[PDB]
Amino acid sequence: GKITLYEDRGFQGRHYECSSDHPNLQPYLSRCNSARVDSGCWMLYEQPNYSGLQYFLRRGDYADHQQWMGLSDSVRSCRLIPHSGSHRIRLYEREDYRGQMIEFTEDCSCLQDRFRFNEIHSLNVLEGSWVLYELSNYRGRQYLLMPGDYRRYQDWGATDARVGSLRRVIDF
């Protein structure tokens, strides 16, 4: 993967190119207001060490922070998300893999259609990476999920268990 991050809008100003995860961009960028993703799937984070608000970007040009749904020009770390040809996730009503479970292998724009709860309290990512969204139709806060177990909502970087939708990280 390859991303170039620019301080100013429209790909202007000081920039930094990443081909790997970077946990602290402060030495290289004072702000980030545009991005060119040459290849790969990336998660940008507001704070260092993959913390704070998260934003998913894929191949293409983002001329201002709003183009990645950003709320500010704060980008202080970034992660390269591995590709996967298959996706499978189990979502649970209660913490520690209890309560109602539903398994997804495809995107879901309204979680509440079938998973009739407004919160997800634990989940197991069996295959592929996914983005969880606070609100329906892929809106609100984003939380990246990668293969492994998540026993509580704090484990995916959220401050509450509300989820409205979820989609696979795909590069096509």
* Residue listed under structure tokens 């060119």: 36
The bridge status of strand 41-47 relative to strand 51-57 is antiparallel
Instruction: Give, in order, the Cα–Cα distances in Å from 155 to each of 82, 111, 148.
Output: 19, 20, 11
Sheet holding 34-39: strands in order across? 12-18, 2-8, 34-39, 60-62
Residues facing 101 on adjacent strands: 92
Nearest residue to 156 (alpha-carbon basis) of 145, 148, 165, 172:
145
Nearest residue to 157 (alpha-carbon basis) of 104, 79, 98:
79
Method: X-ray
* C-alpha–C-alpha distance, residues 119 and 53, integer Å: 19
What phi and psi values does residue 125 have, to the nearest 5 degrees?
A: -90, 105
* C-alpha–C-alpha distance, residues 135 and 37, integer Å: 26
* C-alpha–C-alpha distance, residues 155 and 93, integer Å: 15
Instruction: Give, in order, the Cα–Cα distances in Å from 19 to each of 8, 39, 54, 136.
Output: 21, 9, 18, 32
Give the start-to-end residue ranges of the domains of the chain: 1-83, 84-172
Asked whether the beta carbons of 53 and 32 are under 8 A apart, the reply is: no
For every residue of 49-112, DSSP letters joined together read TTEEEEEEE-SEEESSGGGGT-SSS---EEEEEPP-S--EEEEEEEGGGEEEEEEESS-BS-GG
Nearest residue to 61 (alpha-carbon basis) of 43, 37, 84:
37
Sheet holding 51-57: strands in order across? 77-81, 41-47, 51-57, 139-145, 130-135, 165-168
3-state secondary structure of 10: helix
- Tally the C-alpha atoms within 13 A of residue 23's C-alpha that lie toward its C-beta: 1
Asked whether the beta carbons of 87 and 130 are under 8 A apart, the reply is: yes
Query: For residue 117, what are its two tokens?
Result: 């709860």
Residue 94: partners with Cβ closer than 8 Å, 6 or more residues away: 121, 122
What phi and psi values does residue 117 have, to the nearest 5 degrees?
A: -140, 155
Instruction: Give, in order, the Cα–Cα distances in Å from 53 to each of 56, 70, 94, 116.
Output: 10, 8, 24, 26
